[PDB]
Structure 1
Amino acid sequence: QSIDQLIKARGKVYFGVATDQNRLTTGKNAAIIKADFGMVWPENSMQWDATEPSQGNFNFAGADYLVNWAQQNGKLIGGGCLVWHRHLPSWVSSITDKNTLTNVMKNHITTLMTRYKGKIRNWDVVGEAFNEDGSLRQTVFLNVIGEDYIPIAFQTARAADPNAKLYIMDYNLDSASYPKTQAIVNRVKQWRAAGVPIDGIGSQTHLSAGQGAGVLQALPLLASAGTPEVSILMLDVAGASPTDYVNVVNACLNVQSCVGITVFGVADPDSWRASTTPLLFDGNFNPKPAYNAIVQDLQQ
């Protein structure tokens, strides 16, 4: 049974997955995505080092492949991450002039979003902007532009494609009593009160065994920032316990503004932490107990 169909029947938008061209041409990934998932995200093909490896000179072949495949197969598309420190070519992080970096950042945002205008439901505009203690992470963007880089990024994105839902994303937002969770709420409330067009908070949910239960309290806390949407992004769970996965799904169901869940790949051997077997399909592309538990939870 399709978990995307079942989550749509419960009033949500999607159950999605990260993928890219060489996943769609190998394994059983394309067949599983066609049958069971409703949204695709680029695993790597829209990151900055993949798309703008020298200034103004874009690499779109990989991203175009994904967008085309999704349109042919009737899937929604997400995109990201537009502004991020972790996937950033050296030419960017070596700029020291505020005006120049602002224009580089706006050109990167506008070029990607314009190319796919109207085709992308969600964009992750800014990612991993917070330290664990809730202060802003001192990346090249913060150091050179200042905290205004976040408002500027979102304003620029809204102008490039008004159809898209604009997200900030981060990880370690999985516990309601962890400082980073309340900090992103505090700052997103302030930014929205200043008119910054942040439509969503995306929680990049990488859990250890037993941590699913805490998402039931963390996700409603994230929703208290008042964004129109929240999502669970790039979900995986070490051990892939049915209990952990069902708890995350039920947190989504319990939060009215949570539109859906994306998992960080199809099958365990293709995970960035494969030894923890953290996904919903095994190395032979069979659905694991957690997959079947999600099916039953969405019916029950």
Structure 2
Amino acid sequence: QSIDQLIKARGKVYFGVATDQNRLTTGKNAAIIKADFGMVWPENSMQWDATEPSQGNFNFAGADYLVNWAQQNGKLIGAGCLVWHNFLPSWVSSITDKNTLINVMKNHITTLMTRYKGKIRTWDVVGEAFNEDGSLRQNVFLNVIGEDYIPIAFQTARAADPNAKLYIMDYNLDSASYPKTQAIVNRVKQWRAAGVPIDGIGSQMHLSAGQGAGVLQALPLLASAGTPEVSILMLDVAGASPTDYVNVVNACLNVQSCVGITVMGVADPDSAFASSTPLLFDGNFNPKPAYNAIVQDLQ
């Protein structure tokens, strides 16, 4: 049974997965994505180090492969991350002039979003912008541009492709009492009050065992910021307990504005955390107990 087909029948948009060319051409990834998933994100091929390895000079081959495969197979596309501290080339990190970094960041956003204009359902525009205490993370953008970098990124993105849903995403938003969870909500409210076009908050749910239960309180807290959408991103759970995975899926079902769920990969050996067996398919590409538990929960 297809978890994407089932979640759509419950009124959600998709069950998605991160992938890229050389997963699509190996294992049983393409077959499983075709049957069971409704949306794909490039895991790496849209990040800054992959797409703009030197200033103004873009590399599209990998991202084009993913986008084309998705279109050929009738899948929605999410992509990102346009602005975050991960996967950031040293040429960007070196920049000290505010105007220069604003131009660099806007060129990066506009070039990527223009190439794929109208093809991308969801763009993760800003990622990992918060410290664990809820203050803004002192990455190169904050240090050089200041906190306006976030409004500028979103306004630039909206102009480049008005059709895309624009998200901010972060991790450790899994507990409703944690300061980071509270802070992203409070700041997204403020930005949206200033007219900043933040359509979504995405929660990067890289979970430890037993953390599914807390998401039942954290996800509605995230939704209280008033964005039209929220999403679950990068989902994996150490041990892949059915209870953890079902709690996450039910949090999605409970939150009206939660459009869907993206898992970090298909099969355990292809996880960055393979020892923790944290995905829904095993190393022979067979569905695990958590996959079947989600099926039953959604039926």
* TM-score normalised by structure 2 residue count: 1.00
Deviations 1:84-121 (A, max 9, x none): 11110000000000000000000000000000000000
Aligned to 2:81, what secondary structure does the other structure show? coil
Cα deviation code 1:159-217 (max 9, x no counterpart): 00000000000000000000000000010000000000000000000111000000000
Q: 1:197-276 alignment to 2 at 5 Å?
A: 197-276=197-276
Identity level (%): 96
Task: Provide the residue aligned with 2:77 in structure 1.
Answer: 77
Secondary structure of 1:81's match? strand
| Deviation readout 1:48-93 (Å, 9 max, x if unpaired) | 0000000110000000000000000000000000001111000000
1:15-68 residue CA offsets vs partner (Å, 9 max, x unmatched): 000000000000000000000000000010000000000011000000000000
Q: Secondary structure at the match of 2:67?
A: helix
Equivalent residue of 1:82, what SS?
A: strand
- SS of the aligned residue for 1:234 comes to strand
Q: Distance in 1 between matches of 2:80 and 2:268?
A: 23
SS in 1 for 2:234: strand
Q: Distance in 2 between matches of 1:87 and 1:29?
A: 24
* 1:200-242 CA distance string (max 9 Å, x none): 0000001110000000000000000000000000100000000
Deviations along 1:233-252, one digit per CA (max 9) or x if unpaired, are 01000000000000000000
Determine helix, strand or coil for the equivalent of 1:40: strand
State how far apart, in whole Å, the 2-side matches of 1:68 and 1:291 are: 27
- What is the RMSD of the two structures over their aligned residues, measured on CA atoms? 0.4
| 1:101 corresponding residue in structure 2 | 101
- Alignment size in residue pairs: 299
Unaligned ranges ≥5, structure 2: none
Structure-2 separation of matches of 1:61 and 1:54 = 15
**TM-superposed deviation, 1:143:** 0.3
Runs of 4+ in structure 1 over 2 Å off: none
Match of 2:292 in 1: 292
Q: Distance in 1 between matches of 2:104 and 2:210?
A: 42
Once the two structures are superposed, what CA deviation does each residue of 1:106-144 show, in whole Å capped at 9, x if it has no partner?
Answer: 000000000000000000000000000000000000000
Looking at structure 2, the residues matched to 139 and 41 of structure 1 have their Cα atoms a distance apart, in angstroms, of 24
- Give the Å deviation of 1:11: 0.2
Match of 2:51 in 1: 51
Q: Secondary structure at the match of 1:203?
A: strand
Secondary structure class of the residue paired with 1:173 = coil
Return the alpha-carbon distance in structure 2 between the equivalents of residues 220 and 95 of structure 1: 38
Distance 1:87 1:179 in 2: 26
CA distance in 2, matches of 1:75, 1:218: 29
Query: How many Å separate the matches in 2 of 1:139 and 1:234?
Result: 22
Q: How far apart, CA to CA, are the structure 1 residues paired with 2:31 and 2:224?
A: 38
Partner secondary structure for residue 292 of structure 1: helix
